[PDB]
Design a protein around this ligand. Structure first.
Ligand SMILES: O=[N+]([O-])c1cccc(/N=C2/N=CCC(c3cccc(Cn4cncn4)c3)=N2)c1
Lengths: 258, 296
């Protein structure tokens, strides 16, 4: 009911700054690396695919993971545990009702005891001080999507996909606010499907000129260009399905007009 | 929890009993929610995971303030500010006379500002009902109980198995869209207002279908003129009996013209036309709002 959209939109924005992780942090983890994180996330995408979880639940979980990583050192040994806990919370916050813990435990090939997953959820909560309502790219796209003329669901799919894609690599994408990536995504996806571009609407709503978008664009386009060689694939295989119009099948376009 | 003295139980809701209790160090009175923390079955419940993160962002006079969370190993404690009654109780304790006009248009006003805040923070309450509205002896009244609230950063998909309540539930849900909107909060408030007016639940159904039909008996059954969409809603049936929209002043005699205009916008069938909290606050009916205290 466009009576709130604005207020909200603006709140997202202000939030999205507070609830952000530490750019430079993979660097202080003495025992984990970007790569390992990519592992973990692809892995979540999947787990999400299996329990038919919404995409937001995923976005949330990573958020959690990053922030959480963002003040806790954690051994290669612990991290998937950290994942699960996040995955569990996230669902809890997000989904109409979650999977039961047990499932959560089982999807790690009984590697952690249901107790430790519990002792974890609680630690996470403790570290993110129950601050669970985090802004996601998804949240952003969704508002964004309101301003399509017309709408067109290839785009939508394409964007989400893009979106998810970036979940994967702290790498570059930690450097970028959820709302930007959003942008990047939407417009990458727009261009890609329609050859149209980031609508003045949205520049007006967001104050993001297309220019401002440009650095996060470059990265994202590359990611998309390589997507198919990426070391992790769960996300593609996911946007392969009809429910998404195999968007991910369909060809990146080779240059951006920039 | 060292510094709380439990003083007496004052309710359950949802994974927890509520105590009246007092902080032995400041003397402040508070309401403690104690949560069943089974650290072997389920971990922290999804309600408590909502209520807390949500309330923790909403800070405001007609939202119940959440003071502090004591997170032990086996126990989770939510410390709320403290309010003496609930509107349900009030209205019960007060039907026969009825809640004073003035008090009512005060309450509704405040609930609107509470809700109005909720929505503009992308936050949906879903569980509006006099039991979940607390009043104090200064004539305040505060949205409370956020175990059902959801953030709507993205649209909020319906439960087919709504554990949600009758009585105050938008027709659009009863015909089963796959999303909630702001509107449903309003619809509830709508009905509460009514009830507050007339000392009886406006729409006391006994089943999903009785409930539809009570509404239809009052609002009259809807068409496509009135609610473009209807005929194609999953739970919709050309089976439905035609009732005929009734004069509001039949339903809410005591209400003056301004009141009724407000009500009938509140209860609009089309989620997309039903007035918002923001906008209601600007309605004429609010013009001479004040701030009477209850007879508590
Ligand atoms: O019915 N109550 O919960 C109730 C009755 C009378 C007085 C009450 N006082 C307080 N004071 C502070 C907080 C508070 C409260 C906060 C959150 C949840 C609840 C429990 N609840 C309220 N409606 C349904 N469940 C109570 N109640 C509560």
């Amino acid at each position: 009911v466009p009576d709130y959209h604005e207020d909200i939109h603006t709140y997202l924005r202000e939030m999205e700054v507070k609830c952000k992780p530490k750019v430079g942090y993979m660097k202080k983890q003495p025992d984990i690396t970007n790569s390992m994180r990519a592992i973990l996330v692809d892995w979540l995408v999947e787990v999400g695919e299996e329990y038919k979880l919404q995409n937001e639940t995923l976005h949330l979980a990573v958020n959690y993971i990053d922030r959480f990583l963002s003040s806790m050192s954690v051994l290669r040994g612990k991290l998937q545990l950290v994942g699960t806990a996040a995955m569990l919370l996230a669902s809890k916050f997000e989904e109409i009702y979650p999977p039961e813990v047990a499932e959560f435990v089982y999807i790690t090939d009984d590697t952690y005891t249901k107790k430790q997953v519990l002792r974890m959820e609680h630690l996470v909560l403790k570290v993110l001080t129950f601050d669970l309502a985090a802004p996601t790219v998804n949240q952003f796209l969704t508002q964004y999507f309101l301003h399509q003329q017309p709408a067109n669901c290839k785009v939508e799919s394409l964007a989400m996909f893009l979106g998810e894609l970036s979940l994967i690599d702290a790498d570059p994408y930690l450097k970028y606010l959820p709302s930007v990536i959003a942008g990047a995504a939407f417009h990458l996806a727009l261009y890609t499907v329609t050859g149209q571009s980031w609508p003045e609407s949205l520049i007006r709503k967001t104050g993001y000129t297309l220019e401002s978008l440009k650095p996060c664009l470059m990265d994202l386009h590359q990611t998309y260009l390589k997507a198919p060689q990426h070391a992790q694939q769960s996300i593609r295989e996911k946007y392969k399905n009809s429910k998404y119009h195999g968007v991910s099948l369909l060809n990146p376009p080779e240059t951006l007009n920039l | 929890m060292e510094n709380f003295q439990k003083v007496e139980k004052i309710g359950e809701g949802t994974y927890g009993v509520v105590y009246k209790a007092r902080n032995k160090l400041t003397g402040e009175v508070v309401a403690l929610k104690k949560i069943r923390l089974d650290t072997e079955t389920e971990g922290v419940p999804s309600t408590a995971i909502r209520e807390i993160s949500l309330l923790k962002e909403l800070n405001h006079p007609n939202i119940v303030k959440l003071l502090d969370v004591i997170h032990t190993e086996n126990k989770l404690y939510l410390v709320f500010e403290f309010l003496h009654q609930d509107l349900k109780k009030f209205m019960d304790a007060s039907a026969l006379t009825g809640i004073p006009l003035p008090l009512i248009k005060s309450y509704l006003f405040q609930l609107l500002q509470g809700l109005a805040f909720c929505h503009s923070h992308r936050v949906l309450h879903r569980d509006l009902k006099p039991q979940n509205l607390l009043i104090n002896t200064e004539g305040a009244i505060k949205l409370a109980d956020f175990g059902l609230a959801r953030a709507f950063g993205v649209p909020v998909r319906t439960y087919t198995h709504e554990v949600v309540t009758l009585w105050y539930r938008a027709p659009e849900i009863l015909l089963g869209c796959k999303y909630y909107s702001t509107a449903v909060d309003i619809w509830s408030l709508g009905c509460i207002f009514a009830e507050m007016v007339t000392r009886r639940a406006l729409f006391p159904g006994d089943s999903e279908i009785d409930q539809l039909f009570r509404i239809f008996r009052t609002l009259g059954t809807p068409d496509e003129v009135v609610w473009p969409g209807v005929t194609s809603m999953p739970d919709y049936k050309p089976s439905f009996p035609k009732w005929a929209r009734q004069d509001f002043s039949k339903v809410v005699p005591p209400l003056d013209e301004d009141g009724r205009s407000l009500l009938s916008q509140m209860l609009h069938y089309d989620p997309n036309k039903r007035i918002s909290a923001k906008a209601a606050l600007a309605h004429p009916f609010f013009q001479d709002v004040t701030k009477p205290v209850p007879h508590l």
